[PDB]
C-alpha cells in the first residue's frame, strides 16, 4: 500500500485501555500505527501529535491508520477527551516506530504436544501467532534464542489468536526436561508461509 506523505514511520499503538476513546475508535494494540491526524502526516518524532490531541479535546479527529495485520490503511474518527474516566486523552500508549516489515516477525504456533510447556502456557495450535516479547525479535534474535536464555524461567510472550482476533499475554516456562526435544513442545512456523491471515472480517 502507498503511504500518503511517504515513509514508513508512525506511532505504533502498544496499549489501548478498555472503554477509552481509542478503544471506541477501534485501535488495536500491536498491529496499528497512527500515520496521520486530520491529514497531517506524523512522520517525525515531535510534539505535533500530543499538541493536536490537546487542541481537539471533546472534538472528533480523523486518524489514518496502517495495520500490520491487514496491511491496509484505514481512516477512523476519535474524540480525545478529558471526561472519559481513565488516563490520557485517547487512553492509548504509543511509540514512534517504523511499520516496514512489522507483519514479518511473527511465529506461528503449529501442533502443540499434550503436557508440554506450550500446552501449560495455554498456546493454541494453528490459531496462535507469537508476535512479540518484552525484548525485540527477529530472525537472529528469534523465538528459539529467547527461549534458550529463559530456560527454567517464566517468559512473557504476546500472542495473537485468529479465532478471537485479539492479543493476549502468555507466560511460558521453557523446560528442556519436559520429555521431548527442545524446551517448548510445539511446532513453530516462520516466514511468508506462516503470516497472520490478512482478512479477519468479511
From Swiss-Prot:
Region feature (Important for membrane binding): 188-193
Region annotation (GRASP) ranges: 9-202
Subcellular location: Golgi apparatus membrane; Endoplasmic reticulum membrane; Golgi apparatus
Residues modified to Dimethylated arginine: 24, 41
Every PDZ GRASP-type domain range: 9-99, 105-193
Mod. after translation: Myristoylated. Myristoylation is essential for the Golgi targeting.
Subunit description: Homodimer. Homooligomer. ER stress induces phosphorylation-dependent monomerization. Interacts with BLZF1/Golgin 45. Identified in a complex with RAB2 and GORASP2. Interacts with JAM2 and JAM3. Interacts with members of the p24 cargo receptors. Interacts with CNIH1 and the cytoplasmic domain of transmembrane TGFA, prior its transit in the trans-Golgi. Interacts with KCTD5. Interacts with TMED2 and TMED3. Interacts with SEC16A in response to ER stress. Interacts (via PDZ GRASP-type 1 domain) with core-glycosylated CFTR in response to ER stress.
Function (record text): Key structural protein of the Golgi apparatus. The membrane cisternae of the Golgi apparatus adhere to each other to form stacks, which are aligned side by side to form the Golgi ribbon. Acting in concert with GORASP1/GRASP65, is required for the formation and maintenance of the Golgi ribbon, and may be dispensable for the formation of stacks. However, other studies suggest that GORASP2 plays a role in the assembly and membrane stacking of the Golgi cisternae, and in the process by which Golgi stacks reform after breakdown during mitosis and meiosis.
UniProt family annotation: Belongs to the GORASP family.
Designated name of the protein: Golgi reassembly-stacking protein 2
Encoding gene, per UniProt annotation: GORASP2
Amino acid at each position: 500500500v502507498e503511504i500518503p506523505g511517504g515513509g514508513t514511520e508512525g506511532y505504533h499503538v502498544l496499549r489501548v485501555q478498555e472503554n477509552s476513546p481509542g478503544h471506541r475508535a477501534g485501535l488495536e494494540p500491536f498491529f496499528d500505527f497512527i500515520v496521520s491526524i486530520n491529514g497531517s502526516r506524523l512522520n517525525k518524532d515531535n510534539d505535533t501529535l500530543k499538541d493536536l490531541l490537546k487542541a481537539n479535546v471533546e472534538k472528533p479527529v480523523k486518524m489514518l491508520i496502517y495495520s500490520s495485520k491487514t496491511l491496509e490503511l484505514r481512516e477512523t474518527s476519535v474524540t480525545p477527551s478529558n471526561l472519559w474516566g481513565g488516563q490520557g486523552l485517547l487512553g492509548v500508549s504509543i511509540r514512534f516506530c517504523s511499520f516496514d516489515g512489522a507483519n514479518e516477525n511473527v511465529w506461528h504456533v503449529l501442533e502443540v504436544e499434550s503436557n508440554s510447556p506450550a500446552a501449560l502456557a495455554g498456546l493454541r495450535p494453528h490459531s496462535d501467532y507469537i508476535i512479540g516479547a518484552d525484548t525485540v525479535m527477529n530472525e537472529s534474535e528469534d523465538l528459539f534464542s529467547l527461549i534458550e536464555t529463559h530456560e527454567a524461567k517464566p517468559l512473557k510472550l504476546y500472542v495473537y489468536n485468529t479465532d478471537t482476533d485479539n492479543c493476549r499475554e502468555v507466560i511460558i516456562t521453557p523446560n528442556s526436561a519436559w520429555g521431548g526435544e527442545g524446551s517448548l513442545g510445539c511446532g513453530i512456523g516462520y516466514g511468508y508461509l506462516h503470516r497472520i491471515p490478512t482478512r479477519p472480517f468479511e
